[PDB]
């Protein structure tokens, strides 16, 4: 009775299909999952994808001549829309095929089994709003520490903790812990819940999605917050959902120190370059040696079979002299996540974790032998050291 017939602007269409196509699976056991769902009605077109784990859905303006729904190959539609000329795109469902016309280019794709296509999950009740940029930044700063699929499930996720208008993101891989606290706007009072989101999915949603100024997080309301089984993210005309992890996150807080025996403040860029130079001779990028004394940092690394490098930097150091080694890659990951012009290190023992956090004027107001109370910060990158011979 009704077959979708719609006219669209190329940019809106190609961009929408592009964003939705990122959540598409490759060679899924369920063929229909490889399709993109197009639903045109009133004066808009909705473009959707789903893989039983992540859902992507975006609505764009559209000139509807006939509403309807159709399921077409996702990657193929994405490629076509990329390659279309900057002209109006006419889409018309005809029988078992879908005509797509743009200028002189004409495509005829076969329709997929929209009957066997699963229903998209409905986002839980809205829980709060978060500034888009800050949310994406926090995610980026924490995801660096998340474990990869090789490790246990609990480590492959970003823990999202909400307590009123303050939320904390945490991720660890058993060697580095990243924690970021930020302020948000809760649409429910005195909420207190914690969930575990797949780190890859959340980081992806941050990099590619999260358009606009504010982002609405949907985990539920009242007591059902976080118990709905999925995280919803709505921003502008985009909405996505992610299945949550059932695994329980480690009690990461009892890894953080209360005081430091030594403190060291230095410029992020300077330290990063020096680390990148010295690390070129580490046997497997495995170990860089840091020697703090007076106000000097002696970096070193290497073997006699590969080579031996070293470099001295000026450092604002206070406390007991220290010699501690780290993984060069892990170290540069932390420094890269700080997003500060200057870093402060908090040390206890060469065999215990080190605290990497942005520097503050208070740090420059220290001149005692220690110990030093662990200051409160918005972001912390705790890095476990490497044993020394």
């Amino acid at each position: 009775l009704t077959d979708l017939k719609v006219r669209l602007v190329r940019d809106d269409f190609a961009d929408a299909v592009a964003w939705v196509a990122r959540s598409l699976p490759s060679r899924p056991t369920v063929p229909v999952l490889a399709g993109v769902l197009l639903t045109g009605s009133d004066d808009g077109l909705t473009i959707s994808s789903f893989d039983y784990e992540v859902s992507a859905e975006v609505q764009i303006p559209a000139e509807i001549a006939a509403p309807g729904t159709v399921l077409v190959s996702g990657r193929l539609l994405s490629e076509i829309t990329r390659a279309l000329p900057n002209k109006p795109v006419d889409l018309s469902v005809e029988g078992t095929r879908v005509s797509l016309t743009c200028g002189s280019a004409r495509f005829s794709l076969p329709t997929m089994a929209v009957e066997d296509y699963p229903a998209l999950p409905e986002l839980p009740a809205e829980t709060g709003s978060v500034p888009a940029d800050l949310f994406a930044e926090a995610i980026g700063q924490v995801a660096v520490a998340a474990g990869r699929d090789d490790t246990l499930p609990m480590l492959t996720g970003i823990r999202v903790e909400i307590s009123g208008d303050r939320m904390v993101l945490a991720a660890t891989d058993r060697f580095r812990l990243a924690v970021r606290e930020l302020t948000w706007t809760t649409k429910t009072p005195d909420v207190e819940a914690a969930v575990l989101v797949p780190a890859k999915t959340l980081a992806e949603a941050a990099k590619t999605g999260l358009d606009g100024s504010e982002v609405q997080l949907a985990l539920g309301a009242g007591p059902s917050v976080g118990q709905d089984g999925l995280l919803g993210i709505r921003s502008e005309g985009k909405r996505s959902t992610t299945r949550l992890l059932d695994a329980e996150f480690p009690k990461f807080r009892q890894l953080l120190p209360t005081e430091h025996t030594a403190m060291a403040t230095i410029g992020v860029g300077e330290l990063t370059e020096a680390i990148k130079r010295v690390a070129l001779v580490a046997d497997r990028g495995a170990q860089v040696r840091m020697e703090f004394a007076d106000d000097v940092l002696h970096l070193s690394a290497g073997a006699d079979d590969v080579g031996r490098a070293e470099e001295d930097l000026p450092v604002s150091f206070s406390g007991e002299p220290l010699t501690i080694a780290f993984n060069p890659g892990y170290l540069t990951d932390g420094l890269g996540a700080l997003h500060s012009e200057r870093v402060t290190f908090g040390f206890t023992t060469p065999s215990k974790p080190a605290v990497l956090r942005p520097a503050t004027e208070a740090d420059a107001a220290l001149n005692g032998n220690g110990p030093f109370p662990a200051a409160e910060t918005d972001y912390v990158y705790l890095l476990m050291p490497v044993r020394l011979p």
Binding site: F175, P250, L255
Partner: peptide, 6 residues
Amino acid sequence: QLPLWG
């Protein structure tokens, strides 16, 4: 390399 826990 040492672990944070375990």
